[PDB]
Amino acid sequence: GEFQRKLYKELVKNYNPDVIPTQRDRPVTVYFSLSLLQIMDVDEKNQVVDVVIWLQMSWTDHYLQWNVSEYPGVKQVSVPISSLWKPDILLYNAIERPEVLTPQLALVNSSGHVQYLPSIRQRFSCDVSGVDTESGATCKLKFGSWTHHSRELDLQMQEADISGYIPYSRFELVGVTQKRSERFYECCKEPYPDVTFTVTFRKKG
Amino acid sequence: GEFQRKLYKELVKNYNPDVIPTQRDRPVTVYFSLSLLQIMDVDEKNQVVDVVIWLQMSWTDHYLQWNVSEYPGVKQVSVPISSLWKPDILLYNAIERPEVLTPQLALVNSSGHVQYLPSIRQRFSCDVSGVDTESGATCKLKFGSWTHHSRELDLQMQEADISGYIPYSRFELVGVTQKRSERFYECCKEPYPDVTFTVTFRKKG
Amino acid sequence: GEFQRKLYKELVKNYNPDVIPTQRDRPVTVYFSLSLLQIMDVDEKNQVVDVVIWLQMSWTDHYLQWNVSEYPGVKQVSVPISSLWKPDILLYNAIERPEVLTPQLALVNSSGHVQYLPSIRQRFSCDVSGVDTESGATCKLKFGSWTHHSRELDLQMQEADISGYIPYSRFELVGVTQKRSERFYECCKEPYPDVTFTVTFRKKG
Amino acid sequence: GEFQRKLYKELVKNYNPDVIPTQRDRPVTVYFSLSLLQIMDVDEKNQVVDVVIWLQMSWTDHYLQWNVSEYPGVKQVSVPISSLWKPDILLYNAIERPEVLTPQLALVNSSGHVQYLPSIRQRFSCDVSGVDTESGATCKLKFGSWTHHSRELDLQMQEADISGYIPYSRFELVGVTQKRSERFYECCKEPYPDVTFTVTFRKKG
Amino acid sequence: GEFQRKLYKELVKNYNPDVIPTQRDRPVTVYFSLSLLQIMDVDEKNQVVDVVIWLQMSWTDHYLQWNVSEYPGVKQVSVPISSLWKPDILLYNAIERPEVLTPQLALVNSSGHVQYLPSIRQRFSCDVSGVDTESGATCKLKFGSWTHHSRELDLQMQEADISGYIPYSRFELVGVTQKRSERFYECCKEPYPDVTFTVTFRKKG
Ligand SMILES: *[C@@H]1O[C@H](CO)[C@@H](O[C@@H]2O[C@H](CO)[C@@H](O[C@@H]3O[C@H](CO[C@H]4O[C@H](CO)[C@@H](O)[C@H](O)[C@@H]4O)[C@@H](O)[C@H](O[C@H]4O[C@H](CO)[C@@H](O)[C@H](O)[C@@H]4O)[C@@H]3O)[C@H](O)[C@H]2NC(C)=O)[C@H](O)[C@H]1NC(C)=O
Ligand SMILES: *[C@@H]1O[C@H](CO)[C@@H](O[C@@H]2O[C@H](CO)[C@@H](O[C@@H]3O[C@H](CO)[C@@H](O)[C@H](O)[C@@H]3O)[C@H](O)[C@H]2NC(C)=O)[C@H](O)[C@H]1NC(C)=O
Ligand SMILES: *[C@@H]1O[C@H](CO)[C@@H](O[C@@H]2O[C@H](CO)[C@@H](O[C@@H]3O[C@H](CO)[C@@H](O)[C@H](O)[C@@H]3O)[C@H](O)[C@H]2NC(C)=O)[C@H](O)[C@H]1NC(C)=O
Ligand SMILES: *[C@@H]1O[C@H](CO)[C@@H](O[C@@H]2O[C@H](CO)[C@@H](O)[C@H](O)[C@H]2NC(C)=O)[C@H](O)[C@H]1NC(C)=O
Ligand SMILES: *[C@@H]1O[C@H](CO)[C@@H](O[C@@H]2O[C@H](CO)[C@@H](O)[C@H](O)[C@H]2NC(C)=O)[C@H](O)[C@H]1NC(C)=O
Ligand SMILES: O=C(Nc1ccc(Br)cn1)[C@@H]1CCCNC1
């Protein structure tokens, strides 16, 4: 791509990926969603769950926009996430770092809309004593920004599915639910939005 | 030697390896193939398979071509893959990152034809309940680009091998098959090509 | 952030993050505290404890201050800890490196006050023979600077918590305590401050 | 000291360590040899062997030569292998990456002769069903260049050792042998040299 | 603070940390010593020992000296070891890389005297068949430079400790000893100094 190469040359000018791309008094809105793909194992003694999940993040970076008439054919581009601002979201339940299974790339369109969809292997903390009963075991997965409050980063959920769930795993799903919440912590005087996914599962036999 | 060093100096000028090397409305065609070398282990409880496979990728980068009369004796060069555009292909079944066994190098000829043949240790998801029966257990390995559609990256399969398979492993092969598929998904208005390899194997005793 | 981007450009000028930001004959005061989140496992044979703990560090870097009238709306900024001076604190009991669960980011306000709150998975050495008794097993966690004495880095403790402790872990807490200590060795004429947190716990069965 | 520092400044000028240092129609000859230090474990079920081996590589880089009269006292220098051209040799039997135990440094003399002697922990594939018999189990270790043919990189073996072998390991050696081989495939018109070491060992009980 | 920042700016000028800081025909003398902190585990089948040890290295770098009258108050500085020349010492018995537990920092005074005291978790090879007897099991730990001979790097031992040994480990110490040696080998025409520490220990039950 000749035009793509000219575009990347224009896009890098003055762009600093350590700065959140806010504007006037508008936050950056980040749409967040999840697909549970597989439950791999449960550690009943240490109260741990091992999963593969597919995170889905979307936002708008007003510094990454261009005139599509000026760069013809260049509808959307594939950029390594390392060279963009990325929201600093994390799973509060985790007891190990995430292992990232997908390429570390994001899609960007001409509006400056960004899409980043990492698939991750993750172990996390949960009371799983009921996993071998009819009613099963329920676990929470709280996600949110580490350093940014509502007025800087507006976290917003989108609807999940379980169409990706694996049929041949020895755990079946009894229920899922999701909820956006906004809260105060003692630390900080502003409010912090989180998105929490709840999964009830159990052993098949 | 001397000429190769002058060549690398000319090739780096203006080359950006984060940009796919397309032109007008010609995709980059990537020829993709595979050799299964060994099945290392199977986890019957967690439904996982552990393998060593030898991936074979070939494409053409019109920015990596040179006049062989200007660089005499320089027929082909050995370049670290880190300094080229590389196709963003992945195994959709994987539940861990790949462990790469080979040097991270590619061969490039004077036309700009590129060749990259990584050998990989990889664990992936498969229903292997039938692995201890006469008919055995069948597993799929779906490969494809993470961000690029047909009009940008034309995935094309080539005929695969089991001539390298290991005789002393405790699993025998009952059959293999391979299939290219092209599909439309709700997400995107363009089509996405994948290449899928299917292996049926079973335990010897 | 337009102003944030201008600010980072001014803050990097002459900043060297390998130099401790002392001034005249004032040390850098570092306020240090902790929250115990979970006891994951105990190795009775090897005398090891596995935990998740949330460290809380605060200090002031007089090179990171700015006039808020010059950078309007810029109250506080989110910076990667890699590009600041960071205190060289460690856990003297540790027998493995720390696994850092949180994003490696710190908050900085317009005074130059810095805040860094890593959450960590850590294995460490402790006599845990009494863990299966009524009175239980007591373990110490000694923290302090590796290279800096009191006149350069003034370590100060703050009151630690167990409000985050996990209810479903198979260990219950019998008590906690904390103590700052300042000490001389024959070697060196200056004193060295440490902060030590003590936890008594036991097995629920 | 002073002269070594001046020498490194002159040696880096125009040196590109991604280019093989060939000349006219002379390959780079690489002398390759090995010492088996210890057999650590054998996995009879998965057909794997775990070893520590000491590789010994020597070659000549005509770009790394200097006049010893101009740099007096500077007979040989210790350089990090990362800043030289290194041959792209690998073990074809390996099923995991190598764990390098030694410092990543090479010795260079005033002729431009280079010496690099990494010691490595390595797991590899071998039929070890006979390991518990009188005649024992034989395993091959095939080494060679990944991208370079005979006219570019002349692989040459040298006589190997077992004088370093550990007496207290539970495996004894019944024999070793070594062989250089040169081979054609239909694909490619140039020949490819490998060096293979064969070890027969058995369990002492 | 201000003066330290000016000093680091002057010290980096012309400093190349890949070059050993020798002078005329004076080697760099490196004083080396050790404290055994804990024996963590023993593998009786594979003949391996797991330890934590505290290495103590001191030398003089005549390029890192400054006039204390010119940089008032600047008695000593804390520098990351990555930006200095460091001696290339290793443990010849090791079968895994070292896990470094301490911050990677060294102390430097105005004379150019350097101090670097890494604490390390390390597994190594030893005959430990006698570990369950009255007389116990003896193991050697040979340290020395990988690339430097006596005329460049003069290794010198200093008297070691067991005052830091852990009382609650299930191994007790029966004795320690230490010895500096200098040798010629066929390889090399110059002599090579090593420092070896011997530890006899046994199981308490
Ligand atoms: C960046 O973020 C930091 C992090 O806290 C802020 O720093 C604090 O700022 C506050 C607000 O100005 C300071 O508050 C003052 O603290 C002083 C503390 O010192 C005394 O008290 C304790 C004893 O318990 C000891 O630390 C010390 O030895 C002293 O004895 C007080 O002197 C002040 O009290 C006075 O002010 C109040 C107003 O709040 C008056 O109403 C009272 O009458 C009284 O006169 C006050 O409490 C605090 O010092 C700072 N803390 C730290 C840790 O630095 C920065 O302010 C913030 N950036 C910006 C721009 O605000
Ligand atoms: C860059 O990508 C973004 C994300 O796909 C595009 O934004 C989307 O734009 C469309 C039309 O502008 C929006 O569709 C409308 O949605 C509402 C309901 O949500 C509905 O009432 C309308 O009838 C219509 O369906 C869509 O909401 C919007 N989504 C987001 C998250 O912004 C954008 O158009 C792309 N840019 C270019 C130049 O193609
Ligand atoms: C730089 O280092 C290299 C190390 O290899 C030196 O090269 C080799 O030096 C040896 C010295 O023994 C030469 O050996 C010769 O080999 C025959 C063996 O049949 C022997 O009979 C001769 O008497 C002689 O010793 C060898 O020629 C040479 N390497 C090769 C590939 O031929 C080199 O000398 C060093 N240079 C300097 C200036 O230090
Ligand atoms: C660069 O490599 C390409 C691909 O290997 C070469 O093109 C092939 O050459 C063979 C000759 O045996 C043809 O039959 C194939 O059809 C070609 N393949 C493709 C995919 O085009 C080409 O010859 C090489 N370049 C040079 C200058 O020799
Ligand atoms: C820099 O540090 C070295 C390391 O200790 C100091 O040298 C030692 O100082 C004592 C006390 O005078 C002597 O008895 C030792 O023999 C010295 N040398 C060594 C190699 O241990 C040195 O004095 C310090 N320099 C300054 C200017 O403070
Ligand atoms: O022990 C305290 N804090 C503390 C100490 C260690 C740990 Br772990 C957790 N919390 C006291 C508790 C009562 C109030 N003052 C601090």
Residue numbers in the entry:
A (entry chain E), B (entry chain D), C (entry chain A), D (entry chain C), E (entry chain B): 0 to 204
The authors write:
To this end, we employed α7-AChBP, which is a previously designed chimera between the human α7 nAChR and the Lymnaea stagnalis AChBP and has 64% sequence identity with the α7 nAChR ligand-binding domain. In the present study, we expanded on these observations and engineered α7-AChBPVS, an α7-AChBP with additional humanizing mutations in one of the allosteric binding sites, known as the vestibule-binding site. The neurotransmitter-binding site is located in the ligand-binding domain at the interface between each of two subunits, whereas the channel gate is at a spatially distinct, yet conformationally coupled location in the pore domain. The vestibule-binding site is an intrasubunit site accessible from the receptor vestibule and located opposite to the neurotransmitter-binding site.
Fragment molecule CU2017 binds to a binding site near the β8–β9 loop in α7-AChBPVS (in red). CU2017 contains a single bromine atom and the observed anomalous signal unambiguously pinpoints the location of this fragment molecule. The bromo-pyridine moiety of CU2017 points deep into the β8–β9 site, whereas the piperidine moiety points outward. Additionally, interactions are formed with interacting residues from a neighboring pentamer in the crystal packing, Val-67 and Ser-68, and it is likely that these residues contribute to added ligand stability in the A subunit. Upon co-application with acetylcholine we observed that CU2017 causes a concentration-dependent inhibition of acetylcholine-induced responses of the α7 nAChR with an IC50 value of 26.7 ± 1.6 μm.
